[PDB]
Amino acid sequence: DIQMTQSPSSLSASLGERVSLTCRASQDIGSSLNWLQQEPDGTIKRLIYATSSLDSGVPKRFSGSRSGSDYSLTISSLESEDFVDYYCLQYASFPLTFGAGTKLELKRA
Amino acid sequence: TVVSETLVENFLSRAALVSKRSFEYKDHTKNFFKWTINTRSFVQLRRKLELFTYLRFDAEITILTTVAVNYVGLPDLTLQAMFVPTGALTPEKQDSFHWQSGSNASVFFKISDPPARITIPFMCINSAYSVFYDGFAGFEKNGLYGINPADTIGNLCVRIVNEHQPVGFTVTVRVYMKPKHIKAWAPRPPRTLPYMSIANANYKG
Amino acid sequence: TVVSETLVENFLSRAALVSKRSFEYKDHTKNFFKWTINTRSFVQLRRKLELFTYLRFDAEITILTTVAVNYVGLPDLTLQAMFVPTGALTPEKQDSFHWQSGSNASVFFKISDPPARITIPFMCINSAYSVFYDGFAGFEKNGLYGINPADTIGNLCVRIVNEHQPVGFTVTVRVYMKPKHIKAWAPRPPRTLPYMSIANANYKG
Amino acid sequence: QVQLQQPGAELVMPGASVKMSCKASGYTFTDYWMHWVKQRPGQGLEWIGAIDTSDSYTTYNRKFKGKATLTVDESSSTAYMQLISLTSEDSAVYYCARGGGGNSPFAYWGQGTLVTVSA
Amino acid sequence: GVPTYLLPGSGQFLTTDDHSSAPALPCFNPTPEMHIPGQVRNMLEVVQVESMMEINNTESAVGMERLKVDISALTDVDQLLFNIPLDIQLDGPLRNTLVGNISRYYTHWSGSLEMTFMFCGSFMAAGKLILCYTPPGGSCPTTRETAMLGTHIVWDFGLQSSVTLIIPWISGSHNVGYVTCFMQTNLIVPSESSDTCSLIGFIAAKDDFSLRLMRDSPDIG
Amino acid sequence: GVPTYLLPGSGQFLTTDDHSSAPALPCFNPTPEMHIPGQVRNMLEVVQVESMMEINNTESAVGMERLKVDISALTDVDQLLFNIPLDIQLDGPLRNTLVGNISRYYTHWSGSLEMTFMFCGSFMAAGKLILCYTPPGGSCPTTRETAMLGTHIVWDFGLQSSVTLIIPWISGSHNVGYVTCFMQTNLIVPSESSDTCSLIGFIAAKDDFSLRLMRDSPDIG
Amino acid sequence: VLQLKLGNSAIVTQEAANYCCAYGEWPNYLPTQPETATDRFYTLKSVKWETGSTGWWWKLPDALNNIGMFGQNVQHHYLYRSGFLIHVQCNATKFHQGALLVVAIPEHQRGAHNTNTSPGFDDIMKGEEGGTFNHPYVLDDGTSLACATIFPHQWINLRTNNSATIVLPWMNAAPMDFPLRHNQWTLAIIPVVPLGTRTTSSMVPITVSIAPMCCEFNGLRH
């Protein structure tokens, strides 16, 4: 199965400090990709689909871009509820696979 | 009420616009576009070529450049249209040398002039192009379905030769492709259902 | 997966940019450039020609001129491209007569027009050019190593015919050279190591 | 208006495997796909398979081939999940998505079930 | 050199022009041509191949049964089975065919067509039918005898399993023809065989079918 | 005079075009052509010349010993000596050769290759080796017998001092082949001779080796 | 009645005359050969054809991936070019009605309904088991079945002829191809007219035979 490499697997950031997550695929999936938000309660919610396109009702702080060899998820401003598990998925061809994931952490003492 | 033109050569050969793009140029104080020049994008030429399985033709590319206004007057820009064949890696460090390498074929044309017209020959490993390829890409064992690595013509790269010009005009480039020396094999049924995606044959209905 | 083009004539012959220069022109209240048109500067053509020892070809020079903007509009300048063969001393008293002497070959071309294209013949004392010369320059006994005085084509001198024009535009000149009638002898090994200097064969590693 | 419901837990011992219910409301069930996603407590997302509503055509993963069995019902506009021979190794939170013509997206999700097996 | 003057319309870009241009990659030899079965040098060879007509087009008709016309044993004598319009641009049974889909790229079409009918029912099915054609402006038949005034043939289920019909050179460009089929006698099937049989129509093009004036296909999808 | 009209694309500058232009210095006679040994009219003649493969490529391998593979008398039976990938674009033993460096200016390459092995050890060295080739997707040999299922030859140090190997027409463009070598028997050397010997591999091109589609060399330096 | 004997085996068949040559040509040799090693007709598993049967498809050589002697040479060599002789014989009595369309689709790109996701490896190559038509009216590639007759085909009618024989030469852009990657032809049996009978449900078996006649192999390994 075509594997989606999501890096970095973890990061530590405070409120603000925009950080983008980059995924890389061994094959070309075209413009078809999806991003999913995973809440600690067990409920998954979509955020970004088909690059620049976004979900209705989700605030504009979520954004994405493509260098053409990579897929990036850019968040303008972070928050206290913005700590989740992000994953990049390829729905272009069966089977559908999931990325590695990143767990956002807060800098503390 | 009440066979010369019915030939395949006259049927498949027509001038159509396979690429339409206009880059916004006002103040940069970059400008370029590349595309795989494939027939699956323009919808009328796609279904036109979905009738046949294998095709052998020489692509004839003609670049038409028009400049719009966003009275100053229209200056004459110098444009460079370079064809990048398959197999040339593109590590773009723009403002320096890849475009100007003597390996790739380039052409220079002004704004006011007869449209630049070049004829791309037949570049393939096999005997003819494959419109319908049943299989997977390369040998990855799970490699991409519906795309044959054996047939790729290349990328058409066009940029402006001159440096930044202080105008707010937008340059519009039109690329027409009329195939010649067309040879057909294995005609297939037409596809009535709409095209959901250009990457594969999936239908909606 | 799965001899015509392999010939040396098609292999060494390609259009490449051997000189890139843009002179700053705003207000002078001079403008010109000369260079030895040698193949050791452009890095891809150098190693391209380092494969062979002696070479016989006729250089074909084409000058492409583009004017940038630093809406006014682009006026049409008149440029003069003069070729200075080896042996002509250059005591430059500009604004007066050397350029206009009838001995040197000159060509006039406008900004908007087909690019000026001239074919320089084969000028040598010996039978062919020497890419690899083992010895010293002339007989000085300690004379310069690695440069053969026997082979020098000349200098390419280009200036604008018209006087100072009150514009802030910068003129960009591009010179392409495609050799023809190429004859090869004594092929050598390619050089993998980078070029430290164009004056000799020293390597870094 | 439109949502997905898959309540319950249903812990079970080996020798038999429980079968999922996925019910949809708010859209025409016959015109849209049904997907499945498996959330493992080891933070695995591993995907199960997709089923068409109109036909019985399904798609299964290599490692999950021969285990999972998909079936749907257009009368009740629901979706079922049939496993076989679950052991103490398999435990996870099951999800079922929709998709569609464009994007075949994941936009709507269920609440999730807690599956914990023990010997 | 040779003095020349520019003619009116010089330098323009024409879409339909044919001229030689400078090649992009000289000294390149394309791959030689291997012999590939089924070389098509003319679009008429694709049209001359028989295609399926859909006669079952009605309300709530979708899928595989649009290709067949159900005939049961409870039908009466002299009942109209169907009518096939010959209009290519409008939607008849001929909307999607091999002759129809190719003709939509053109305007003027002239030539003689052909229709082939095949009975897919059981071997013991008895009875006879009638196959008639309507000339342009031909007073479409009310019941039977009006169809008999033209070219017709009596076709039996038991003897001939196929139909050969040559239609004389229709014409159209940018209500003329029709095909009428009725029940000559009742359908006789045994007790073990099913009551409902079906048929499949076919259409092809003769050697005199001609085309010209290329245009764009009206159907985007 | 003769009326003419400008064709689309007139006046443009093409890089690959070939046309005659006005000479810069007329009435100038170039130096006549003396006969110079080694006139090369084709790039394939340079490729057909044998070149050195570097088989010793490893970690911390720099300099002259990258051309040879050390074989001592303490080695055991059936130990893998090396493997040679046939990929030109990637880096194998073939990265820098006469066939490799010229092929990097092209994309599509098709032809039959040849490999020559020479034993540089002493005269009294005994023992035998095995020389095998791997077909594309050929289940790379674990130890020995898997390599034997293909084309192979048993080569002796004492009898033949050279190797002639013809490889059947590989192909590549923008894991297929391999070369497997093992130890048939132990290396037998006398007391006065050194324990360590070496080998030198060679590769050339046959007469069917073809090239096309010129491009730029990937290696800047 | 006439038995067709090829190799060490044979199958009782109807009289074979004026058989259909795909695109009017026959699988000649490329200008060792398996006229002995892999020769004989390989009979696939008989499929049960009922009233609600949409159809079946076997890609070439998908159903042949591992079959008998031919299954060895698939992964054994590097390349091949092979012709195919397909004989589909459907045995039924005179009281059964229906029609079966046996058509060979060269270069068949499959598809899905109401989604943009491309099928995976297990969905394309099913091996010997073979697939089932999801929507046989649209052929699953998006085209129409009405104009699908442009390919080589034969008609199996329980009235006239209960069997069909189709010969497929080598159709490819390349002289040879990869065994486990690309599928040159496709074998499809399309039941345009469904089954009908006095009883509510019946079963009509279908036998399919494929002979890789006049082929070659290169790139010996393993």
DSSP B137-152: SSSSSSPPBS--TT--
Cβ atoms of residues F128 and F154 within 8 Å: yes
| Distance between first and last Cα of chain A | 42
Measured CA to CA, the distance from residue F179 to residue F135 in angstroms comes to: 9
Measured CA to CA, the distance from residue B134 to residue B124 in angstroms comes to: 18
Residue B119 has which token pair? 């004829």
Residue D109 has which token pair? 């999700």
User: For tokens 């014409």, what's the residue?
Assistant: E171
Measured CA to CA, the distance from residue F74 to residue B73 in angstroms comes to: 85
Chain A nearest-CA distance from B140, in A, is 9
Q: Is C149 exposed, middle or buried (0-12, 13-18, 19+ CB in 10 A)?
A: middle
Measured CA to CA, the distance from residue B78 to residue B66 in angstroms comes to: 12
C-alpha R_g of chain F: 25
Which of these, C112, E177, C34, G40, lies nearest to F11 by C-alpha position?
C112
For residues C38-57, one letter each, b for 16 or more C-beta atoms within 10 angstroms of the residue's C-beta and e for the rest, the string is ebbebebbbbbbbbbbbbbb
Q: What is the number of helices (H) and of strands (E) in chain A?
A: 0, 9
Measured CA to CA, the distance from residue B22 to residue B37 in angstroms comes to: 16
Residue E76 has which token pair? 């009466």
User: For tokens 């001779």, what's the residue?
Assistant: F193
Residue F185 has which token pair? 């028997």
**DSSP-based three-state secondary structure for B51:** coil
- Distances D32 to D54, D72, D105, G123 between C-alpha atoms, Å: 9, 12, 11, 20
Please identify among residues 58-97 of chain G the ones whose CB lies closer than 8 Å to any CB of chain F: 77-78
Domain layout of chain G by residue ranges:
3-220
Residue C120 has which token pair? 């320089």
Residue B195 has which token pair? 């095209």
Measured CA to CA, the distance from residue F202 to residue E193 in angstroms comes to: 79
Residue type, B126: N
Cβ atoms of residues B119 and B81 within 8 Å: no
Dihedral (C-alpha) F86, F87, F91, F95: value to the nearest 10 degrees? 70
**Contact pairs from chain B to chain D, CB under 8 Å:** 3
Please identify among residues 198-217 of chain E the ones whose CB lies closer than 8 Å to any CB of chain B: 210-214, 216-217
Cβ contacts of C48-52, under 8 Å, gap ≥ 24: C48/C12, C48/F217, C49/C12, C49/C131, C50/C131, C50/C188, C50/C190, C50/C191, C51/C187, C51/C188, C51/C190, C51/F46, C52/C12, C52/C131, C52/C184, C52/C185, C52/C186, C52/C187, C52/C188, C52/F40
Cβ atoms of residues E67 and E52 within 8 Å: yes
* Residue numbers of the domain that contains D68: 3-115
Residue type, F149: L
* Diameter over CA atoms, chain C: 67
- Distances C156 to C66, C86, F57 between C-alpha atoms, Å: 18, 11, 47
Within 8 A by CB and 6+ apart from B134, the residues are G59, G107, G108, G109, G110, G124, G182, G183, G184, G186
Residue type, C82: M
DSSP code at position D88 = T
- The distance from CA A55 to its chain's CA centroid, rounded to whole angstroms, is 14
Asked if B78 has any chain C CB less than 8 Å from its own CB, the reply is yes
| Distance between first and last Cα of chain G | 43
Which of these, D53, F86, B77, lies nearest to G134 by C-alpha position?
D53
Measured CA to CA, the distance from residue G86 to residue G70 in angstroms comes to: 15
For strands G216-218 and E199-205, give the pairing. Answer: unpaired
Which of these, C156, C139, C157, lies nearest to C148 by C-alpha position?
C139
Residue G34, preceding peptide bond in cis (omega within 30° of 0):
no
| Distance between first and last Cα of chain C | 36
User: Which of E24, E31, E105 has the CB atom closest to B105's CB atom?
Assistant: E24
- Distances E80 to E144, G68, G94 between C-alpha atoms, Å: 9, 55, 29
CA C69, C74, C79, C81 torsion-angle sign = positive
* Residue numbers of the domain that contains B98: 1-205
Residue A70 has which token pair? 């990579």
Residue E2 has which token pair? 């040779």
* Closest residue in chain E to residue F106, using alpha carbons only: E28
- Distances F208 to D90, F168, F170 between C-alpha atoms, Å: 59, 11, 11
DSSP code at position B87 = T
- The distance from CA F145 to its chain's CA centroid, rounded to whole angstroms, is 27
Which of these, E88, E64, E98, E59, lies nearest to E173 by C-alpha position?
E88
Cβ contact, residue pair G192, E101, below 8 Å: no
Please state the three-class secondary structure of chain G as a single string.
Answer: CCEEEECCEEEECCCCCCCEEHHHCCCCCCCCCCCCCCCCCEECCCEEECCCCCCEEEEECCCCCCCCCHHHHHHHCCEEECCEEEEEECCCCCCCEEEEEEEECCCCCCCCECCCCECCHHHHCCCCCCEECCCCCCCCCCCCCCCHHHCCEEEEECCCCCEEEEEECCCCCCCCECCCCCCCEEEEEEEEEEEECCCCCCCEEEEEEEECCCCEEECCCC
Residue-by-residue DSSP string for C30-92 = ---EEE---TTSSHHHHHHHTTEEEEEEE-EEEEEEEE----------EEEEEEEETT-----
Continuous H helices in chain F? 44-47, 98-103, 145-148
Measured CA to CA, the distance from residue C25 to residue C31 in angstroms comes to: 8
Residue type, C102: G
Measured CA to CA, the distance from residue C17 to residue B77 in angstroms comes to: 20
Cβ atoms of residues E84 and E170 within 8 Å: no
Q: How many CB atoms lie within 10 A of CB D63?
A: 9
DSSP code at position F162 = B
As beta bridge partners, residue D85 has none
Q: For residue C9, what is the enclosing H or E element? A: helix C8-12
Measured CA to CA, the distance from residue B172 to residue F131 in angstroms comes to: 62
As beta bridge partners, residue F165 has F115
Cβ atoms of residues D53 and D106 within 8 Å: no
CATH: 3.30.413.10, 3.30.465.10, 3.30.70.100, 2.60.120.20. Which one for G3-220? 2.60.120.20
Cβ atoms of residues F152 and F131 within 8 Å: yes
Within 8 A by CB and 6+ apart from C172, the residues are B161, B162, B163, C22, C65, C66, C67, C68
Chain G nearest-CA distance from A93, in A, is 4
Q: How many CB atoms lie within 10 A of CB C175?
A: 20
Against chain B, the chains showing at least 3 CB pairs within 8 Å are A, C, D, E, F, G
Q: For residue E110, what is the enclosing H or E element? A: strand E109-119
Measured CA to CA, the distance from residue G68 to residue G61 in angstroms comes to: 13
CA G52, G54, G60, G61 torsion-angle sign = negative
Cβ contact, residue pair C61, F24, below 8 Å: yes
Q: For residue B48, what is the enclosing H or E element? A: helix B43-49
Asked if D103 has any chain G CB less than 8 Å from its own CB, the reply is yes
Q: Is B61 exposed, middle or buried (0-12, 13-18, 19+ CB in 10 A)?
A: buried
Backbone angles phi, psi at G122, to 5 degrees: -70, -25
Cβ contact, residue pair E200, G158, below 8 Å: no
Measured CA to CA, the distance from residue C98 to residue C106 in angstroms comes to: 12
Measured CA to CA, the distance from residue C38 to residue G193 in angstroms comes to: 79
**DSSP-based three-state secondary structure for E157:** coil
Measured CA to CA, the distance from residue D7 to residue B36 in angstroms comes to: 49
* Closest residue in chain E to residue B126, using alpha carbons only: E31
Work out how many domains chain D is built from and give that number: 1
For strands G3-6 and G9-12, give the pairing. Answer: antiparallel
Measured CA to CA, the distance from residue B52 to residue E41 in angstroms comes to: 12
Instruction: Give the angle F54-F55-F56 at the CA atoms, nearest 5°.
Output: 100
- Distances G105 to B132, B191, F82, G141, G187 between C-alpha atoms, Å: 11, 14, 47, 11, 7
Determine F/A contact with 3+ CB pairs under 8 A as the test: no
Chain A nearest-CA distance from D14, in A, is 25
Which of these, G129, A35, G79, B190, lies nearest to F137 by C-alpha position?
G79
Residue D67 has which token pair? 């285990």
Continuous H helices in E27-185? 44-47, 98-103, 145-148
Measured CA to CA, the distance from residue G38 to residue A46 in angstroms comes to: 54
Measured CA to CA, the distance from residue E152 to residue E129 in angstroms comes to: 11
Instruction: Give the angle B200-A72-A2 at the CA atoms, nearest 5°.
Output: 45
Q: Phi-psi category of B146—alpha, beta or left, where left has phi over 0 and alpha has psi -120 to 50?
A: left
CA E38, E43, E48, E51 torsion-angle sign = positive
- The distance from CA G142 to its chain's CA centroid, rounded to whole angstroms, is 21
Residue type, G138: V
- Distances C110 to B77, C160, D7, E121, E164 between C-alpha atoms, Å: 14, 10, 80, 83, 75
Within 8 A by CB and 6+ apart from G114, the residues are B204, B205, D31, D32, D33, D100, D101
User: Which of A32, A91, A93 has the CB atom closest to G120's CB atom?
Assistant: A93
As beta bridge partners, residue A71 has A23
User: For tokens 């033993």, what's the residue?
Assistant: F93
Measured CA to CA, the distance from residue D73 to residue D22 in angstroms comes to: 10
Q: How many CB atoms lie within 10 A of CB G222?
A: 15
Asked if B3 has any chain F CB less than 8 Å from its own CB, the reply is no
Domains in chain A, CATH or no CATH each: 4-106 (2.60.40.10)
Please state the three-class secondary structure of C154-167 as a single string.
Answer: EEEEEEECCCCCCC
